[PDB]
Amino acid sequence: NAQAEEFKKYLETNGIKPKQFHKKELIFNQWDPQEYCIFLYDGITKLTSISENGTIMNLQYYKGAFVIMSGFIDTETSVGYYNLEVISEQATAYVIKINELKELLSKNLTHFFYVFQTLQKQVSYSLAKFNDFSINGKLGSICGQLLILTYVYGKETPDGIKITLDNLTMQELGYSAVSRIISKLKQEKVIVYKNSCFYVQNLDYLKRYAPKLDEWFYLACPATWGKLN
Amino acid sequence: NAQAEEFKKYLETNGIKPKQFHKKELIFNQWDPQEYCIFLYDGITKLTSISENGTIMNLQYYKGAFVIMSGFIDTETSVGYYNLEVISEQATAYVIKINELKELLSKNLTHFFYVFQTLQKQVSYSLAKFNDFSINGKLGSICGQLLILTYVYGKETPDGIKITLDNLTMQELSSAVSRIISKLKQEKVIVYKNSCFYVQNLDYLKRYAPKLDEWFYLACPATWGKLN
Ligand code: NA
Ligand code: NA
């Protein structure tokens, strides 16, 4: 991606260097009083919220290049008590104290717009997920997740559309009611788990039950959306 | 609010002037190729979608002051096939062509930050609502909505936290939804008295909508403190 690469080298030229994180590490955490701007360049991360009960809530999954800010750009206070856990085996992210981000994005506004557009895509993505859910429930929720993963990491094989993402990661992404829906998916042969990898064989089904998230990926990632459309 | 007033003065000084809209009108729609940046200064609105079935879908609600954009700021293309419909009797909004907004923000970064943090507030609201769902179902969803309405338009009287809103607008604010709302009413969480609504068990709402309560504290503590 062009905007992401230009933003990376903008950060690097201003003295901000990348940082490596192995799986299960938190790039930021809900107890740190200092907020940051994570520019997740490479790897797969997970936004979590740990309540006092020790219970972990998976709120969102990000994949570089993306931007995740734990604090408000103006007040610098927490936008929510969240952690960013690396779920891939290793990830590369740029960590920028919320205050320095203002200085850096105020001089060069071209990448200011990049951060802006990432936030906008988050908004539209959440609204599309809410719509798909509110009509087709979790069947559509899981269909939309599988659909976007097929778009990004899917490439064709004699068996279907192989999800090239490593099995370990895909396990980290949850792959009673969820597994029941997934077993029905396997019943109608929409997806097939074979030879250590996932395969999508009926793309139109996932598209049918995730229309709004499909529209979202079309309006937000048209170049990659058209890979299998 | 203050930053909203400053953004208004920035739009005014820069030639952009407001427009008045009426209930059921659309500030923008899902068929217009031109995308805009709406600075909803006053009134209440909802972002809706029309699925292939053809029936309305209420996605989000917005109070002024706030910002709602139909297209991305870089490509100027749609972020989604949505319509902004006024549910208040009157609404005052500034409709800025998206292309112009880029230059306008680039000239002053303070108002850029205002719009950016509005987006951040949206993001955090969506995440907190999803968490409240994962925890307590639609019950917590509607409890969070009632909680936000209580904080915003809540004036405390002995009959409870009276709701400033005209009940015409609350008519806009479906089986299961009305079923849970009426059960909240029957459990005397929200009573009806003297032609108005009164939240007499705010703690119930706080209990079944904790993540959005935290969100409101972290994003608007000014009004959060009044009822806490
Ligand atoms: Na933090
Ligand atoms: Na539009």
Swiss-Prot record, chain B:
Any one Gene Ontology molecular-function term assigned to this protein's record: DNA binding
Domain HTH crp-type: 136-203
SUPFAM superfamilies: cAMP-binding domain-like (SSF51206), Winged helix' DNA-binding domain (SSF46785)
UniProt keywords, alphabetically: Activator, DNA-binding, Transcription, Transcription regulation, Virulence
Transmembrane domains' residue ranges: none
GO cellular component labels: cytosol
Summary of the function given for this chain in its UniProt record: Positively regulates expression of listeriolysin, of 1-phosphadidylinositol phosphodiesterase (PI-PLC) and other virulence factors.
Protein name as catalogued: Listeriolysin regulatory protein
Lineage of source species: Bacteria, Bacillati, Bacillota, Bacilli, Bacillales
Gene: prfA
